[PDB]
Amino acid sequence: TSVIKIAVEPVNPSELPKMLDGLRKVNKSYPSLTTKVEESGEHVILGTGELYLDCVMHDLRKMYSEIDIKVADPVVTFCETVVETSSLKCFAETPNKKNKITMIAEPLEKGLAEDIENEVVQITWNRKKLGEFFQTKYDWDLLAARSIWAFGPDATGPNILVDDTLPSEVDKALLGSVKDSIVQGFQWGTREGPLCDELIRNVKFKILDAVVAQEPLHRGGGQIIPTARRVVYSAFLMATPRLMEPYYFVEVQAPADCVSAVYTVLARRRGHVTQDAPIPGSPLYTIKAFIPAIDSFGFETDLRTHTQGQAFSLSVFHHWQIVPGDPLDKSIVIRPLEPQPAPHLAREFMIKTRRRKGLSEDVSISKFFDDPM
Amino acid sequence: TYQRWQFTLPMMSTLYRLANQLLTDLVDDNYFYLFDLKAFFTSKALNMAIPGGPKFEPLVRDINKIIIRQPIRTEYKIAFPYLYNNLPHHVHLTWYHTPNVVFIKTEDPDLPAFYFDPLINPISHRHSVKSQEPLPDDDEEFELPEFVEPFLKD
Amino acid sequence: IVFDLLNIVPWLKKYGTNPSNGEKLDGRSLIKLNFSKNSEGKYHCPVLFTVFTNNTHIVAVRTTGNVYAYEAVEQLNIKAKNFRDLLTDEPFSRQDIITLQDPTN
């Protein structure tokens, strides 16, 4: 999965159509390469590795374009999540103050998102077989098994919308027609994300209230998508939201006198070693470990440099994991170019990421909290 | 003319022995990953320097949003010289990865040439049940008319 | 590429053209717009509530006069077939839509 990122800009901003054409050529030629045109108008490319990206830059700058194409220094895409449910009901009342949705947020069951991703569960199933898997494998409760609505953001995605307005579910001959509208808001929001414009990760929004207006022309469709997005975001924001970065895996072949140098290399890059063994049938050693990604730049370079070509590593995507930080902590100070001591990684991540994409300065847990003004 | 030599392999091993002190013991190109022609001409044109490497002239001559855990280094700008390196000129393609070669030296003669050296690790072929095949059970029929011997027996 | 009428008023009244284009202009088609005031007072999307900065894309139905995020405009207007106003009932022709800023365009 595309987690590694590059920010590109030509020295000549006027040749920019040409560099764009080149990024189109490489998006066609390298099958795992993704291109994004970010919120400040920058060119970004989503890939999966460093030699990968270097092939990309060689080919763009030389064989698919002829441009002097500056590169910034890379970063990885994060995801937004909640480990705590909203202490209060987070609501959005439609512009015509006649409809209103109240939702809550909470973390999913830990393996449910990974099962979704592996494609063992799908909304495609009927309600009964969906509940079958849910209850039989996760001891799920009957009411929410009957009322699981859709999956966010994408078809096989880590988030869910659940119904729990069973007294106002009795209006289902009306609640159904706005079911699709509220899930349009749900998926749109659970894709965008309020904290730092990164995907909501393994979260579930429960409808605690849905008050409808029985005039279809009044209620429309263009207000129930945004209000549903807004209750998604208000629930996500009244939950204390947490960032997630990848944890790449690394398998190393190293001789007798080099595994501890590898230990220092990893524990320098915030890694931990799951496996340290001799390679059966070989005089070499195998080292399996896990590493954070923004430290994973130059990992293999410096790693083979440390034991002089003897160490050798491969790295790939494994999973995402919480960085030790809190994003909406305005009592966190960051010096603009020194690195961050570990207590405050997610704060720097969120603020630097919103600034780099081009968004505003501050986010509030009551930003989407509707106006009684 | 003394042109165009050819030898025998025992003489080859003897010359190897006599020159053993002026001969590197390198089998792979994993020593000069960052130390080779490509990365050193990269360094020349980029005006970059590597710890144990040569130096040269130059061929020519926002703060908020940066995410920092460990530093984007110079040898990194040499090993991936396109990414962490803004504006590359005459920049070569690093990361040539030769398989880390297993080589075990002969020390004392007895030691048949192909014998499990102490440094190599026990095999321990281990997994779940082996498997079945519809193997050709006997009592149905088979038998060979006999000339056969292994391809090298003498 | 937006401005204020009370600002470009004397320029357009004394010169028949404007600063956005050299070609001649009629003042009438310059249509009123109102941008939301939010909890702090910031210009935030009416339907999406997201805060506007120097960079984010700016979208509007010139028929509706409202100014809301292109995110709102699309994910409400493209997924659903509604080209209507986001805060009002006004169904509009999508050709009337204008954008005040898109750094990537």
XYZ file of C-alpha atoms in Angstrom:
632
model
C 0.000 0.000 0.000
C 1.189 3.490 -0.974
C 2.521 5.137 2.185
C 5.824 6.704 1.035
C 5.472 10.222 -0.409
C 7.442 12.744 -2.468
C 6.904 16.482 -2.986
C 8.126 17.768 -6.358
C 8.422 21.209 -7.929
C 10.215 22.328 -11.099
C 12.819 25.052 -10.869
C 10.833 26.501 -13.781
C 7.181 26.764 -12.675
C 6.267 27.657 -16.285
C 7.351 24.274 -17.703
C 4.873 22.851 -15.190
C 2.589 21.341 -17.870
C 5.649 19.349 -19.022
C 6.508 18.042 -15.560
C 2.803 17.213 -15.210
C 2.883 15.232 -18.453
C 5.916 13.389 -17.117
C 4.175 12.484 -13.878
C 1.341 11.153 -16.051
C 3.814 9.029 -18.017
C 5.236 7.499 -14.844
C 1.763 6.986 -13.378
C 1.062 4.928 -16.498
C 4.414 3.097 -16.624
C 4.958 2.282 -12.923
C 1.813 0.368 -11.957
C 1.955 1.041 -8.189
C 2.644 4.774 -8.521
C -0.024 7.300 -7.524
C -0.060 11.040 -8.253
C -1.714 13.695 -6.100
C -2.223 17.401 -6.750
C -2.217 18.743 -3.227
C -4.289 21.489 -1.615
C -1.692 24.182 -2.234
C -1.349 23.153 -5.903
C 1.854 21.165 -5.394
C 2.721 17.940 -7.201
C 3.080 14.933 -4.893
C 3.660 11.274 -5.759
C 2.522 8.361 -3.572
C 4.772 5.316 -3.776
C 6.120 2.585 -1.565
C 9.912 2.801 -1.404
C 13.156 4.680 -1.816
C 14.793 2.871 -4.749
C 11.281 2.914 -6.201
C 11.095 6.698 -5.948
C 14.637 7.069 -7.290
C 13.730 5.140 -10.414
C 10.733 7.493 -10.539
C 12.866 10.628 -10.412
C 15.449 9.340 -12.901
C 12.734 8.418 -15.394
C 10.632 11.580 -14.969
C 13.556 14.015 -15.027
C 15.185 12.225 -17.990
C 13.047 9.919 -20.147
C 9.478 11.139 -19.609
C 10.356 14.814 -19.113
C 13.331 17.138 -19.517
C 12.689 19.347 -16.505
C 14.859 20.400 -13.590
C 12.515 18.995 -10.942
C 13.342 19.972 -7.372
C 12.400 17.479 -4.666
C 11.586 18.278 -1.053
C 12.248 15.796 1.708
C 9.757 13.016 2.125
C 7.047 12.049 4.599
C 4.482 9.267 5.015
C 0.690 9.472 5.003
C -1.030 9.042 8.362
C -4.501 8.007 9.450
C -6.955 9.449 11.961
C -8.507 7.278 14.648
C -10.277 7.194 18.008
C -9.583 4.912 20.970
C -12.241 6.604 23.148
C -15.927 7.231 22.518
C -17.588 10.634 22.605
C -18.544 11.599 26.148
C -21.376 13.762 24.773
C -23.779 13.468 21.857
C -22.334 15.331 18.872
C -25.009 16.819 16.662
C -25.678 18.838 13.537
C -29.023 20.511 12.901
C -29.761 21.160 9.236
C -29.725 24.757 7.929
C -33.506 24.805 8.033
C -33.450 23.867 11.701
C -35.900 21.006 11.226
C -33.699 17.951 10.711
C -30.925 17.067 13.135
C -28.562 14.112 13.550
C -26.842 13.203 16.807
C -23.980 10.735 16.499
C -21.233 9.280 18.670
C -17.861 7.820 17.744
C -15.905 4.868 19.090
C -13.043 2.531 18.129
C -13.907 -0.620 16.231
C -13.050 -4.138 17.307
C -9.290 -4.363 16.916
C -9.172 -6.985 14.148
C -12.313 -5.893 12.300
C -10.529 -3.314 10.135
C -7.770 -5.763 9.190
C -10.372 -8.392 8.285
C -12.160 -5.807 6.136
C -8.854 -4.971 4.419
C -8.006 -8.649 3.870
C -11.504 -8.962 2.318
C -13.028 -11.641 4.509
C -16.077 -9.502 5.419
C -17.995 -7.265 3.024
C -21.229 -5.270 3.033
C -22.185 -7.426 0.016
C -23.469 -10.063 2.440
C -27.084 -9.970 3.526
C -27.933 -8.563 6.939
C -28.283 -12.072 8.384
C -24.882 -13.345 7.182
C -23.253 -10.036 8.136
C -24.621 -10.520 11.642
C -23.599 -14.180 11.416
C -19.917 -13.330 11.005
C -20.063 -10.342 13.358
C -21.630 -12.171 16.289
C -20.023 -15.584 15.811
C -16.466 -14.249 15.483
C -16.598 -11.101 17.681
C -19.516 -11.900 20.044
C -21.330 -8.885 18.572
C -24.668 -7.665 19.929
C -27.901 -8.379 18.061
C -29.135 -4.777 17.892
C -26.016 -3.320 16.263
C -25.614 -6.429 14.105
C -29.034 -5.680 12.609
C -28.181 -1.983 12.231
C -24.660 -1.791 10.743
C -25.146 0.538 7.784
C -22.069 0.998 5.612
C -18.282 0.944 5.562
C -16.032 3.971 5.486
C -14.560 5.372 3.553
C -14.388 2.730 0.828
C -16.154 -0.582 0.191
C -13.470 -2.481 2.105
C -12.592 0.153 4.661
C -11.829 0.291 8.349
C -14.859 2.264 9.577
C -18.577 1.668 10.100
C -21.832 3.606 10.473
C -24.258 1.994 12.950
C -27.919 2.785 13.621
C -29.126 2.979 17.216
C -32.249 5.171 16.902
C -34.632 2.218 17.213
C -37.489 4.445 18.499
C -36.995 6.704 15.461
C -36.118 3.701 13.313
C -39.867 2.941 13.459
C -40.143 5.742 10.902
C -38.114 3.562 8.521
C -40.526 4.315 5.655
C -38.893 7.768 5.908
C -35.562 7.015 7.591
C -34.555 4.794 4.665
C -34.639 7.550 2.051
C -32.218 9.634 4.134
C -30.197 6.559 5.065
C -28.337 6.930 1.758
C -27.896 10.685 2.248
C -26.499 10.325 5.769
C -24.160 7.590 4.570
C -23.006 9.847 1.733
C -22.054 12.379 4.382
C -20.573 9.531 6.436
C -18.272 8.208 3.723
C -17.256 11.643 2.452
C -16.259 12.706 5.959
C -14.638 9.444 7.062
C -12.512 9.882 3.944
C -11.469 13.511 4.494
C -10.985 13.692 8.265
C -11.103 16.718 10.582
C -7.842 16.513 12.563
C -5.197 16.619 9.835
C -6.978 15.710 6.572
C -5.962 12.071 6.896
C -8.244 9.076 6.743
C -10.337 8.060 9.723
C -8.932 4.691 10.817
C -10.970 1.946 12.517
C -13.795 4.142 13.856
C -17.552 3.624 14.155
C -20.228 6.320 14.276
C -23.479 5.426 16.027
C -26.681 7.318 15.224
C -28.144 8.200 18.626
C -30.636 10.665 17.107
C -32.106 11.250 13.667
C -34.966 13.764 13.464
C -36.243 14.111 9.899
C -38.493 16.583 8.100
C -41.225 14.684 6.230
C -41.182 17.078 3.191
C -38.807 15.603 0.556
C -38.504 18.900 -1.317
C -37.623 20.651 1.953
C -35.154 18.105 3.325
C -33.426 17.807 -0.049
C -30.279 15.798 -0.599
C -27.673 18.569 -0.539
C -28.136 19.278 3.170
C -28.200 15.730 4.505
C -24.797 14.837 3.060
C -23.109 17.875 4.712
C -24.940 17.511 8.051
C -24.013 13.817 8.088
C -20.401 14.751 7.414
C -20.682 17.292 10.220
C -21.988 14.812 12.786
C -19.295 12.380 11.644
C -16.732 15.091 12.322
C -18.312 16.300 15.569
C -18.336 12.760 16.967
C -14.760 12.213 15.771
C -13.744 15.520 17.376
C -15.485 15.002 20.725
C -13.610 11.736 20.755
C -9.973 12.488 21.531
C -8.472 11.697 18.108
C -5.143 9.959 17.635
C -2.760 9.660 14.711
C -1.434 6.463 13.153
C 1.761 6.085 11.104
C 3.061 2.888 9.466
C 5.355 0.353 11.124
C 7.408 -1.193 8.323
C 9.036 -4.592 8.732
C 12.736 -5.280 8.078
C 14.455 -8.643 7.514
C 18.240 -8.511 7.822
C 21.102 -10.870 6.997
C 24.030 -10.083 9.263
C 27.094 -11.999 10.490
C 27.983 -12.865 14.062
C 29.568 -9.510 14.988
C 26.886 -7.275 13.397
C 23.488 -8.075 14.937
C 24.097 -5.638 17.793
C 25.153 -2.920 15.372
C 21.800 -3.632 13.697
C 20.187 -3.334 17.144
C 21.700 0.133 17.560
C 20.653 1.083 14.015
C 17.036 0.081 14.664
C 16.767 1.379 18.244
C 18.131 4.574 16.704
C 15.201 4.552 14.264
C 12.624 3.667 16.962
C 12.506 0.008 15.937
C 12.130 -3.232 17.860
C 13.314 -6.693 16.879
C 10.843 -9.582 16.851
C 13.314 -12.210 15.601
C 17.067 -12.805 15.962
C 18.278 -16.178 14.762
C 20.882 -18.105 12.792
C 19.841 -18.859 9.224
C 19.441 -22.673 9.029
C 21.996 -24.061 6.610
C 23.821 -20.736 6.406
C 26.586 -19.084 8.437
C 24.545 -15.854 8.367
C 21.948 -14.460 10.773
C 18.328 -13.412 10.200
C 16.924 -10.331 11.954
C 13.216 -9.465 11.777
C 12.260 -6.081 13.231
C 9.761 -3.233 12.955
C 10.527 0.428 12.314
C 8.781 3.813 11.971
C 8.817 5.198 8.483
C 9.985 8.819 8.686
C 13.017 7.346 10.423
C 13.067 4.600 7.758
C 14.742 6.987 5.306
C 18.357 6.043 4.744
C 17.817 3.063 7.025
C 19.399 0.491 4.709
C 22.049 2.957 3.493
C 23.351 3.659 6.975
C 22.706 0.067 8.030
C 25.045 -1.474 5.491
C 27.415 1.464 6.085
C 27.572 0.602 9.793
C 28.907 -2.951 9.378
C 30.515 -2.139 6.004
C 28.293 -3.965 3.515
C 27.822 -6.993 5.782
C 24.364 -6.070 7.059
C 21.651 -6.231 4.410
C 17.998 -5.395 4.904
C 14.694 -5.458 3.089
C 11.702 -3.406 4.194
C 8.027 -3.559 3.237
C 4.640 -2.426 4.476
C 3.303 -4.245 7.540
C 0.764 -2.060 9.382
C -0.016 1.277 11.006
C 0.669 2.213 14.602
C 0.184 5.080 17.028
C 2.973 7.600 17.357
C 3.289 8.685 21.028
C 1.573 12.064 20.756
C -1.554 14.169 21.169
C -2.582 16.389 18.222
C -4.962 18.994 19.685
C -2.622 19.970 22.528
C -2.073 23.719 22.251
C 0.155 23.360 25.323
C 2.731 21.656 23.083
C 5.603 23.792 21.765
C 7.720 22.732 18.764
C 10.917 24.382 17.549
C 10.559 24.773 13.790
C 13.558 22.647 12.721
C 14.759 20.559 15.591
C 13.301 17.030 15.720
C 10.752 16.076 18.251
C 11.333 14.300 21.549
C 8.883 11.458 21.709
C 6.055 12.822 23.956
C 4.851 15.188 21.218
C 5.125 13.433 17.845
C 1.460 13.492 16.775
C 1.154 17.206 17.568
C 4.020 18.118 15.251
C 2.695 15.577 12.740
C -0.805 17.091 12.600
C 0.205 20.758 12.568
C 3.080 20.387 10.092
C 0.861 18.201 7.900
C -2.051 20.644 7.773
C 0.369 23.491 7.045
C 2.080 21.462 4.280
C -1.198 20.498 2.620
C -2.285 24.125 2.919
C -5.106 24.038 5.444
C -5.868 26.465 8.257
C -4.011 26.959 11.514
C -6.235 25.619 14.315
C -8.654 22.714 14.785
C -11.225 22.613 17.572
C -13.001 19.731 19.253
C -15.994 22.095 18.968
C -15.119 23.357 15.474
C -18.138 21.573 13.949
C -20.125 22.189 17.142
C -23.119 23.959 15.687
C -23.830 27.623 16.300
C -26.576 28.659 18.747
C -25.559 32.253 17.994
C 56.465 -12.739 -28.173
C 55.490 -14.074 -24.706
C 51.963 -13.091 -25.744
C 48.787 -14.908 -24.887
C 49.376 -17.086 -21.820
C 47.564 -20.207 -20.623
C 48.234 -22.182 -17.448
C 47.239 -25.150 -15.289
C 45.011 -24.836 -12.241
C 47.546 -26.087 -9.634
C 49.950 -23.383 -10.835
C 46.990 -20.993 -10.611
C 46.409 -21.933 -6.964
C 50.141 -21.584 -6.262
C 50.291 -18.093 -7.759
C 47.190 -17.211 -5.724
C 49.091 -18.426 -2.646
C 52.261 -16.454 -3.388
C 50.299 -13.256 -4.022
C 47.775 -13.776 -1.179
C 49.211 -10.724 0.603
C 48.556 -8.278 -2.267
C 45.110 -9.691 -3.034
C 41.847 -8.412 -1.649
C 39.452 -11.105 -0.448
C 36.346 -9.450 -1.936
C 33.837 -11.505 -3.924
C 30.941 -9.045 -4.015
C 30.432 -5.356 -4.797
C 28.791 -4.710 -1.424
C 31.944 -3.039 -0.105
C 31.793 -0.090 -2.533
C 28.086 0.607 -2.308
C 28.659 4.323 -1.731
C 32.354 4.142 -2.669
C 32.181 3.302 -6.358
C 32.464 5.212 -9.639
C 28.753 6.014 -9.820
C 28.320 7.474 -6.343
C 31.709 9.213 -6.408
C 30.968 11.041 -9.665
C 27.561 11.803 -8.147
C 29.432 13.341 -5.210
C 31.777 15.217 -7.550
C 28.999 16.921 -9.500
C 26.814 17.528 -6.438
C 29.792 18.798 -4.387
C 29.107 16.126 -1.770
C 31.571 14.211 0.404
C 31.611 10.718 1.915
C 33.503 9.869 5.179
C 36.346 7.810 3.742
C 36.142 9.139 0.214
C 37.719 11.745 -2.037
C 36.860 15.418 -2.320
C 36.632 17.694 -5.357
C 35.728 21.217 -6.446
C 32.207 22.062 -7.583
C 31.784 21.613 -11.323
C 29.974 24.979 -11.292
C 29.783 26.583 -7.778
C 9.162 26.447 4.791
C 10.621 26.063 8.282
C 7.307 25.215 9.951
C 6.028 22.141 8.137
C 9.114 19.862 8.209
C 8.705 16.452 9.875
C 11.877 15.355 11.680
C 12.662 12.175 13.635
C 16.136 11.279 12.275
C 18.244 13.384 9.868
C 18.090 13.306 6.044
C 21.767 12.600 5.616
C 24.511 13.161 3.049
C 25.286 9.490 2.451
C 21.516 9.180 2.098
C 21.622 11.885 -0.597
C 24.317 9.753 -2.210
C 22.581 6.359 -1.912
C 19.204 7.754 -3.024
C 20.628 10.723 -4.907
C 17.357 11.716 -6.595
C 14.954 12.105 -3.690
C 16.582 13.739 -0.692
C 18.696 15.587 -3.247
C 17.138 18.693 -4.704
C 18.280 19.577 -8.226
C 20.528 16.658 -9.263
C 23.255 17.135 -11.874
C 25.431 14.331 -13.301
C 23.909 12.015 -10.693
C 24.449 8.277 -10.839
C 22.179 5.328 -10.017
C 23.173 3.772 -6.721
C 21.991 0.697 -4.833
C 23.672 -2.127 -6.648
C 23.073 -5.061 -4.340
C 25.293 -8.090 -4.820
C 24.076 -11.089 -2.798
C 26.090 -11.320 0.400
C 28.262 -14.258 -0.624
C 28.901 -17.180 1.721
C 32.592 -18.067 1.583
C 34.300 -20.485 3.969
C 38.083 -20.807 3.930
C 40.157 -23.979 3.762
C 42.523 -24.060 6.748
C 43.893 -27.595 7.270
C 43.956 -30.348 4.680
C 42.132 -33.373 6.079
C 38.755 -31.730 6.074
C 37.280 -33.117 2.813
C 36.487 -30.204 0.531
C 32.721 -30.614 0.946
C 32.054 -31.017 4.654
C 29.734 -29.136 6.988
C 31.944 -26.350 8.362
C 31.491 -25.464 12.050
C 30.429 -21.903 11.200
C 27.384 -23.029 9.192
C 24.187 -23.539 11.203
C 22.122 -26.731 11.674
C 19.541 -27.242 8.946
C 16.611 -28.649 10.978
C 14.117 -29.120 8.137
C 10.888 -28.521 10.026
C 7.220 -28.145 9.105
C 3.817 -29.861 9.301
C 2.898 -33.254 7.799
C 5.001 -34.091 4.744
C 2.402 -35.020 2.084
C 1.124 -37.897 -0.029
C 1.531 -38.559 -3.745
C -0.143 -41.347 -5.748
C 3.250 -43.126 -5.584
C 3.656 -46.219 -7.805
C 2.957 -49.011 -5.316
C 4.456 -52.387 -6.151
C 2.589 -55.705 -6.697
C 0.924 -54.255 -9.831
C 4.024 -54.526 -12.051
C 7.489 -53.077 -12.747
C 11.049 -54.291 -13.448
C 14.117 -53.114 -15.369
C 16.380 -55.071 -17.732
C 19.800 -54.492 -16.248
C 22.695 -52.407 -17.572
C 22.091 -49.328 -15.396
C 24.695 -47.671 -13.173
C 24.874 -44.104 -11.777
C 26.083 -41.438 -14.204
C 29.382 -41.311 -12.337
C 30.160 -44.525 -10.456
C 33.799 -45.265 -11.316
C -11.204 35.520 -9.606
C -13.209 37.481 -7.084
C -13.178 41.020 -5.679
C -15.461 43.551 -4.022
C -17.969 45.715 -5.856
C -17.399 48.610 -3.451
C -13.693 48.304 -4.371
C -13.732 47.837 -8.153
C -16.570 50.388 -8.346
C -14.583 53.554 -9.247
C -12.176 51.610 -11.475
C -15.070 50.146 -13.481
C -17.078 53.381 -13.533
C -14.183 55.527 -14.787
C -12.700 52.814 -17.040
C -15.133 50.516 -18.862
C -12.827 47.530 -18.194
C -11.342 46.013 -15.067
C -8.024 44.737 -13.668
C -8.825 41.024 -14.012
C -9.128 41.278 -17.816
C -8.245 44.048 -20.234
C -11.474 43.486 -22.170
C -14.541 45.627 -21.493
C -16.888 44.904 -18.594
C -20.493 45.415 -17.546
C -20.879 46.101 -13.831
C -24.283 44.460 -13.467
C -23.271 40.803 -13.789
C -20.999 41.152 -10.739
C -23.276 39.300 -8.330
C -23.606 39.513 -4.555
C -22.079 36.807 -2.361
C -22.104 36.242 1.412
C -19.568 34.082 3.254
C -20.385 32.407 6.551
C -19.300 33.599 9.983
C -18.281 30.770 12.302
C -17.573 30.129 15.984
C -14.433 32.277 16.009
C -15.728 34.447 13.166
C -13.599 32.699 10.565
C -14.799 32.232 7.000
C -15.846 28.578 7.227
C -17.827 26.515 4.739
C -21.579 26.843 5.391
C -22.271 23.142 4.832
C -18.864 21.691 5.715
C -17.727 24.061 8.530
C -14.084 23.577 7.468
C -11.796 26.576 7.934
C -10.519 28.490 4.910
C -6.860 29.441 4.539
C -4.601 30.869 1.859
C -4.637 27.570 -0.059
C -7.928 25.641 0.032
C -10.111 25.541 -3.081
C -13.024 27.996 -3.150
C -16.331 26.995 -4.756
C -19.663 28.757 -5.248
C -22.928 28.600 -7.143
C -23.095 32.080 -8.662
C -26.811 31.384 -9.027
C -26.963 30.761 -5.261
C -24.335 33.314 -4.188
C -23.094 31.002 -1.427
C -19.372 30.310 -0.990
C -18.645 26.787 0.283
C -15.725 24.381 0.022
C -15.231 22.522 -3.245
C -15.184 19.386 -1.084
C -18.769 20.119 -0.035
C -19.808 21.138 -3.554
C -18.490 17.926 -5.125
C -19.327 15.278 -2.528
C -22.854 16.715 -2.322
C -23.288 17.538 -6.011
C -21.331 14.776 -7.771
C -22.134 11.620 -5.766
C -25.764 12.656 -5.471
C -27.062 14.193 -8.701
C -28.132 17.413 -6.961
C -26.650 20.590 -8.435
C -28.768 22.626 -6.030
C -27.785 25.117 -3.360
C -26.105 23.702 -0.256
C -27.726 25.908 2.403
C -30.822 26.859 0.394
C -33.301 24.947 -1.747
C -32.113 26.544 -4.974
C -31.569 24.004 -7.763
C -29.018 25.593 -10.065
C -27.427 24.916 -13.414
C -23.899 23.678 -12.774
C -22.566 26.026 -15.476
C -23.318 28.926 -13.110
C -20.790 27.513 -10.621
C -17.696 29.664 -10.069
C -14.480 29.052 -8.138
C -12.551 31.781 -6.342
C -9.274 29.852 -5.984
C -7.746 26.526 -6.986
C -3.929 26.480 -6.774
C -3.967 23.314 -8.872
C -6.029 24.160 -11.961
